[PDB]
């Protein structure tokens, strides 16, 4: 009934992805690896809850936050207990950057939901 979607929101999610992925040599933070993204599927909380273990930066906060937004489960700060999360670490800078790829792909794809 209502004309196309809001593209707007696809700006969004590109630029701020970009501006993270689009940064120095340097990786984020500290270059503190994290637990890899699962672009499979449900890989917002995998994100989320990923970028969430993240202190002394506030600059990737607005991704985390928009991410738990989507993030179909909960993952703030101390609240695991099945031992599922250990899998592969990566450099945060790559982390981030995985981010981008999958979260654009999505966003730009049509299949965001």
Known sequence: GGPVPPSTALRELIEELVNITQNQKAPLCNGSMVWSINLTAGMYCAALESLINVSGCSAIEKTQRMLS??????????????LHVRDTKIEVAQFVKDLLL??????REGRFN
Do not use: T
């Not at 937004?69 to 099945?82: D, E, I, L, R």
């Not at 999958?102 to 966003?107: A, E, P, T, Y």
């Open 69 to 82: 937004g989507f993030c179909p489960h909960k993952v703030s700060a101390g609240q695991f207990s099945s």
């Open 102 to 107: 999958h979260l654009k792909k999505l966003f």
